[PDB]
Amino acid sequence: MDILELSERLDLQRFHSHTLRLYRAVCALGNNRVAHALCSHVDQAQLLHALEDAHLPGPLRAGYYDLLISIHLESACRSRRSMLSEYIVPLTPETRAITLFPPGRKGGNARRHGLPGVGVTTSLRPPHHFSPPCFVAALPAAGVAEAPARLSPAIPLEALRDKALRMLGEAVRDGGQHARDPVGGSVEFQFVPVLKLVSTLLVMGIFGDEDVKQILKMIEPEVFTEELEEGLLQMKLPESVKLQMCNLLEYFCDQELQHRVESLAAFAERYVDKLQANQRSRYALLMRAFTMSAAETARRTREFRSPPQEQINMLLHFKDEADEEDCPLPEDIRQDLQDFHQDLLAHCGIQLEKKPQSLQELVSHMVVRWAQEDYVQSPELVRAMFSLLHRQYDGLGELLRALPRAYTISPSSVEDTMSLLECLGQIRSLLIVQMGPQEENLMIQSIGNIMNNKVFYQHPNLMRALGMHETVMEVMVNVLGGGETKEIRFPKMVTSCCRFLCYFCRISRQNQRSMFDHLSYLLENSGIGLGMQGSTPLDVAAASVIDNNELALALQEQDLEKVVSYLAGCGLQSCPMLLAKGYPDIGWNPCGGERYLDFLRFAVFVNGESVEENANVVVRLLIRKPECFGPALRGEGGSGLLAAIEEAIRISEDPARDGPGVPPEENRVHLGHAIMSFYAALIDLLGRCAPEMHLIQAGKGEALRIRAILRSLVPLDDLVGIISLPLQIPTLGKDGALVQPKMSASFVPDHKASMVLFLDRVYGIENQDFLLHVLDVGFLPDMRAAASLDTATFSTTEMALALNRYLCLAVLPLITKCAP
Amino acid sequence: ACFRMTPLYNLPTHRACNMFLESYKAAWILTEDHSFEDRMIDDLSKAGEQEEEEEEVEEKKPDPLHQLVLHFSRTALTEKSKLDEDYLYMAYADIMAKSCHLEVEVSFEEKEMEKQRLLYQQSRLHTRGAAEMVLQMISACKGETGAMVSSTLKLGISILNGGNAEVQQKMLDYLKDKKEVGFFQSIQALMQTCSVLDLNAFERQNKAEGLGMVNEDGTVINRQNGEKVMADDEFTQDLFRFLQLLCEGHNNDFQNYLRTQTGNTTTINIIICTVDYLLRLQESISDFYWYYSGKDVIEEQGKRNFSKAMSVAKQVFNSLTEYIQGPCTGNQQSLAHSRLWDAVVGFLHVFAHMMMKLAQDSSQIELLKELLDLQ
Amino acid sequence: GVEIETISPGDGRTFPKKGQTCVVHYTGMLQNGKKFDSSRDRNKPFKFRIGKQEVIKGFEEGAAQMSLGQRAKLTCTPDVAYGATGHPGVIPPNATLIFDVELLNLE
Amino acid sequence: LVYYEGGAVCTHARSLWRLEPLRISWSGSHLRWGQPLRIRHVTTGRYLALTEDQGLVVVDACKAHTKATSFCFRVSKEKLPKRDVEGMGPPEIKYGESLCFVQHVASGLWLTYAAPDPKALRLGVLKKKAILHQEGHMDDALFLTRCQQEESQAARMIHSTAGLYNQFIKGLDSFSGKPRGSGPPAGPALPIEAVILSLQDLIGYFEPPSEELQHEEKQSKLRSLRNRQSLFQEEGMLSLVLNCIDRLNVYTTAAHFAEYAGEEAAESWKEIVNLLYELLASLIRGNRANCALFSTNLDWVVSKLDRLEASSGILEVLYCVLIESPEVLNIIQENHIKSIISLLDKHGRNHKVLDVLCSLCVCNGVAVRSNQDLITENLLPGRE
């Protein structure tokens, strides 16, 4: 039956309009795989004819217009829209041609305001991706989670924009007649779908310069002159279309904001050339200033011995005219900047007749007229109206809040910048979709493209301005939230993004400092993160405070309290991850304990010097929690520190106890080695938080108290025994087969390194008796073991290299310090 | 490094433009002053060309400012667990707050003119429901400190300046008929969450200042980044200023309301809770003084810390004075049986040793006179 | 594999061999009689490189027999079509495809 | 058993105690210290008592003989009943002030939290069991707080409704089997009229406020509606109402219900099953916590989507679950998609089914591609 009969058959109309709502539902939020499938049921011909079909009912007409936007335009529009808030302006010759005002002769301060959305914009927005929807093409060889991401179905946008422009003009002319049969059955059903299409195309930038000129003519034919016929702002429209009107004006106000930012970037390009030329010339005249001056030249060379950040501040520090002495710029340059500030405020309408004569005054008058005409009942319309009104009055404010997201880049890196922005758009588009394996591989390959992208290192300030770290952490919150209790699903993306965050912190101090504000946020989410191996979220937390003294000082006390309480639970409960694979049950988790201890080590150790404020806080918590030290050092029913080592070596040597007994999996946990390494991590923490020599010599009360308490905890004999432990040296046998023991299941010098550093920082060497008493049993076998392994074959093995780094980090600096 | 580092003319053009932009905005955009709040509120507050009909009903549909206030009251009254930050509300609360105050033997005549113009500025708002809007947003914030409640308190102060009697009457009537407990639950929560002076934070700040952090692309000299001591001092001062403005003018009806609420099913005694905060402040002042007791001279950062801590204590004392003046016998009995005396003793002990400590040096006269007017 | 019935034959002399693109302006339909895809709705000819297995096997082997300006009705079994996996969301599993192909031009 | 608990646990109806004095006349007189008065729990219909085997428990209403149940308030703990007044009385005890100590009238014991704590409370949230101690510690002073009238009314109707439907369940399972055939019913007559009136009263009690209301007072009724739903589900009534449908769904038709219950109940079978879904829908509507309970038994409604007694009722319950709980969509599988699509082919072109399908795709503005592919795979290519 003819679809126009649904205007009377209201039983079918509700169902079919809801069917079109399901068609939008199955293709909403970038499901372009299904959006390609919808091109079979509703192809391009039906949609285009349904646009111009003037006798279609209300809900059906808006259903097909929204369906067309959802299918062909939503995915591209949303991704572009998310990039409208960023202005990465390259320095190009046509970028230079961008001016705040069009050429004119109306006045020196400011000519007539230019047409919004008309001209050239050089801000980098990635091009849209479209694919022609074809169903007879062969099925891809690659399946799900390996095939490239599907692109949006194609549609001729050059013809579509002409159709939208023509029908919008038709609707304007038809509305002027005030006919009793508006298209679609009502004024709202006549104007809302087409204004939605116009707004979506405007956001995507499909419309050309003349197309924008036409749209401005239909909005207001007299205000937007270039040098019934009534505009869309004088039609007494319902509230529903007023919202789309606000969206239209919002786009133009974004164009004005982008135009101001681009003009500022072009002015930066013009001004830096003269600034650097003048400063360079003054450099030469300062070199010859010694011919007519004396030692007072520090007042002139302070600029050259100061880094450029405050140099430009001193150069530009002449606005109020009471500070011209520190500015060496000649008055022609100062006049140039003061002139550009004058038409900058004129372009913002700060200062310097019913005709609005401009977009800002037109929008302001239009909004206040709408508000005073009738009591607006739509809260969304009210919020949109006042958002536009506030943006017209606070012209400087929107520029002020837009500058932190602005950035200027060299033209030689645009090809990598667009690829980076495309990857960023992929990550942003994945924030609104549930976890999926195909969705999992998309950011992993995008992140790998970010790593391989050189701009990620060349311009980390731009990386922070775009703020990818917030998006990545939000992805972490999403994946950790899903399955927050039973199991953290999809670990492959978890380690990839946490690797990215760790790689992000090490780029620069400011990036690390910015990431540091999410420490508590990360720490709460790290409670269930112990079920993950590799690049754990705790590693991101640890790398957030690495080698940064100021951040270590500013790190809060309850963050360490929470970490120690988690370590307490590690020391009193078994690992659910270990029990999952079938590891035999013991009362504590050494691997999780070591993971917590490594962050504790980074919390109190900075550049070789312990942080006393962090140190006394963390150690006090260890003192208050006696169980954190492990099965040994417990006190009540406890065993010696040395005593737990022989049983740990027994577990490592004898199988079916070191693991499940069913590396073989390349990350197989060795229970004996883990127990044998937890003690090393704990003791290394205790050694690295020890009070410094100058504090002990100064005799601070808490410094001596902490050292005496720590010395009381660990007896000196247990140290000598662990240091005196023989090494499983790789010997040669069975026809030159180098029998190298498993490095994750044998006595490695890593455990002894914490022993020697512990004694050196805490106990120290006082007399010769104690020195030789530890030397003969503990470092003497090590030195002969290294001498025995020093040959053309064994020296390349890991154990000999481990001894090589050993002697020179633990024994030899101790011997050198204790030489006399 | 400074003497052997890269001169300005050798910087890349794009990098050189990058910090030029942030320098230009910091030196020419922040410094630029544009006064548009008064004319924008005037435009929103003027009823334009619809009263000319003079309809029989006289339904008096809201002018744009009243519609805006109603919209914010609606989103404030939405049943929502967390009050999300609204940049639109933040900018409009700020614009409304900056459009009211507008601020040598000046006479009592033109001073009265300035007063009766200030009440005109406040009348432009409080007759349009902004007074009830502020109360609603304080209750809706649920005691979560933030930049949105700070702008809410700033608006309440700006619409309450000089102790506007009708504004206090409207606020009291709105709390009396709504009978919402959440307004005082949130007020108590915000006041408890207010911070005091911290010795540990001071020592860490002093060490950080000793290190002198610098950037890579250039260098910042003596960076004045966010202080971790008395960060919310401005918010605490605003909160107590708002409380003082509520009872200013000896509004004994509202003074009894703060002490106890007849309408509410549960009573929160703000007066004693204010004393509790004064106690937490007096311990902070005593301990921070004890750190300077050994030291012979007080340095500049410690002087700044005292300047703001004493400014907060001044505001707290002004608020406590405003609770009992009139006199309010209920508040007088409450402070008589409260823990106020220990705070008074602690300040007296701090004061006695403090003035003599600042008396042997002439570089602390500015701080000392702030203690003189505080006591 | 495929059954071809001529509809409006053209010259019958020149055939699309390996090396040149095949430009067809076709019209696809399911066996039940419900049209699922065409190219006249898009108003753009479908140009596909021959021999690269980018199109389905039935279409690829069918397209060789028609000549320039020849319109024929094909019939592709599911074996030479998408088969059991079908086309996700468009074509149901194990469906026979009929294509009103019209090889309008080459290159 | 009685416990001391904290947090938002006791804001519900389980923590309401009724102060019922011994005097039949002037029972609402102002409380004066040292008088005998009973303590009753409203939602369970039980009185505090001193039992020999378990100390302090709640005893049924038929075994409260004022000896072990009555308690006396005292201003302090100093060792000291008074004659009743035929009038309003002297106002002594206040709300939130004037701390009172409760001592048993007969045994002289004092309420006190149990100091020992097991391993469950060692790591979990503390729940100090109340043991009626001989003397008590220093801080056993109890504070008395007012509770609002509507929730007190709701508390009473929880016990009334619970007893009414528990009797109805106890009637249905009695003749769950044993087909009647041509004989008489199994046992007592079903309280059909009481159930029907109670159902309709609760449906209007949980009826959402109209859209025509003022937008401020509207959300005040929203807050009241959420509060009512929260207390009702927390008191187990939401768990209780599901069992009613479970018992009644085992019979295919009215005649099949008659063969096991009777012809008198067969006429009202369709009415009661229609109203039960409505009560469930009103109970779970707008509450994400209550709707979250269907994430574990989501297949329960899906299996009953083809039941002819109430198709729209179960569809509305499904809609309420999906529109409110985002997590249910993640639990949705291919079986449920095919079931919902089969509704279109069996119950006609119902647009509400398409509404359910639209709710299956996106929730809270977040796409679910695990469900969108299923919908477009099982529905679109058929073209039927």
From Swiss-Prot, chain A:
<comment type="function">
    <text>Cytosolic calcium-activated calcium channel that mediates the release of Ca(2+) from the sarcoplasmic reticulum into the cytosol and thereby plays a key role in triggering muscle contraction following depolarization of T-tubules. Repeated very high-level exercise increases the open probability of the channel and leads to Ca(2+) leaking into the cytoplasm. Can also mediate the release of Ca(2+) from intracellular stores in neurons, and may thereby promote prolonged Ca(2+) signaling in the brain. Required for normal embryonic development of muscle fibers and skeletal muscle.</text>
</comment>
<comment type="subunit">
    <text>Homotetramer. Can also form heterotetramers with RYR2. Identified in a complex composed of RYR1, PDE4D, PKA, FKBP1A and protein phosphatase 1 (PP1). Repeated very high-level exercise decreases interaction with PDE4D and protein phosphatase 1 (PP1). Interacts with CALM; CALM with bound calcium inhibits the RYR1 channel activity. Interacts with S100A1. Interacts with FKBP1A; this stabilizes the closed conformation of the channel. Interacts with CACNA1S; interaction with CACNA1S is important for activation of the RYR1 channel. Interacts with CACNB1.</text>
</comment>
<protein>
    <recommendedName>
        <fullName>Ryanodine receptor 1</fullName>
    </recommendedName>
</protein>
<feature type="modified residue" description="Phosphoserine">
    <location>
        <position position="610"/>
    </location>
</feature>
<comment type="similarity">
    <text>Belongs to the ryanodine receptor (TC 1.A.3.1) family. RYR1 subfamily.</text>
</comment>
From Swiss-Prot, chain C:
<keyword id="KW-0413">Isomerase</keyword>
<comment type="subunit">
    <text>Identified in a complex composed of RYR2, FKBP1B, PKA catalytic subunit, PRKAR2A, AKAP6, and the protein phosphatases PP2A and PP1. Interacts directly with RYR2.</text>
</comment>
<keyword id="KW-0697">Rotamase</keyword>
<dbReference type="GO" id="GO:0003755">
    <property type="term" value="F:peptidyl-prolyl cis-trans isomerase activity"/>
</dbReference>
<dbReference type="GO" id="GO:0005528">
    <property type="term" value="F:FK506 binding"/>
</dbReference>
<dbReference type="GO" id="GO:0006939">
    <property type="term" value="P:smooth muscle contraction"/>
</dbReference>
<dbReference type="InterPro" id="IPR001179">
    <property type="entry name" value="PPIase_FKBP_dom"/>
</dbReference>
<dbReference type="GO" id="GO:0010880">
    <property type="term" value="P:regulation of release of sequestered calcium ion into cytosol by sarcoplasmic reticulum"/>
</dbReference>
<dbReference type="GO" id="GO:0010881">
    <property type="term" value="P:regulation of cardiac muscle contraction by regulation of the release of sequestered calcium ion"/>
</dbReference>
<dbReference type="GO" id="GO:0005737">
    <property type="term" value="C:cytoplasm"/>
</dbReference>
<dbReference type="GO" id="GO:0016020">
    <property type="term" value="C:membrane"/>
</dbReference>
<dbReference type="GO" id="GO:0007204">
    <property type="term" value="P:positive regulation of cytosolic calcium ion concentration"/>
</dbReference>
<dbReference type="GO" id="GO:0034704">
    <property type="term" value="C:calcium channel complex"/>
</dbReference>
<dbReference type="GO" id="GO:0010459">
    <property type="term" value="P:negative regulation of heart rate"/>
</dbReference>
<keyword id="KW-0703">Sarcoplasmic reticulum</keyword>
From Swiss-Prot, chain D:
<protein>
    <recommendedName>
        <fullName>Ryanodine receptor 1</fullName>
    </recommendedName>
</protein>
<comment type="subunit">
    <text>Homotetramer. Can also form heterotetramers with RYR2. Identified in a complex composed of RYR1, PDE4D, PKA, FKBP1A and protein phosphatase 1 (PP1). Repeated very high-level exercise decreases interaction with PDE4D and protein phosphatase 1 (PP1). Interacts with CALM; CALM with bound calcium inhibits the RYR1 channel activity. Interacts with S100A1. Interacts with FKBP1A; this stabilizes the closed conformation of the channel. Interacts with CACNA1S; interaction with CACNA1S is important for activation of the RYR1 channel. Interacts with CACNB1.</text>
</comment>
<comment type="similarity">
    <text>Belongs to the ryanodine receptor (TC 1.A.3.1) family. RYR1 subfamily.</text>
</comment>
<comment type="function">
    <text>Cytosolic calcium-activated calcium channel that mediates the release of Ca(2+) from the sarcoplasmic reticulum into the cytosol and thereby plays a key role in triggering muscle contraction following depolarization of T-tubules. Repeated very high-level exercise increases the open probability of the channel and leads to Ca(2+) leaking into the cytoplasm. Can also mediate the release of Ca(2+) from intracellular stores in neurons, and may thereby promote prolonged Ca(2+) signaling in the brain. Required for normal embryonic development of muscle fibers and skeletal muscle.</text>
</comment>
<feature type="domain" description="MIR 4">
    <location>
        <begin position="28"/>
        <end position="88"/>
    </location>
</feature>
<feature type="domain" description="MIR 5">
    <location>
        <begin position="90"/>
        <end position="148"/>
    </location>
</feature>
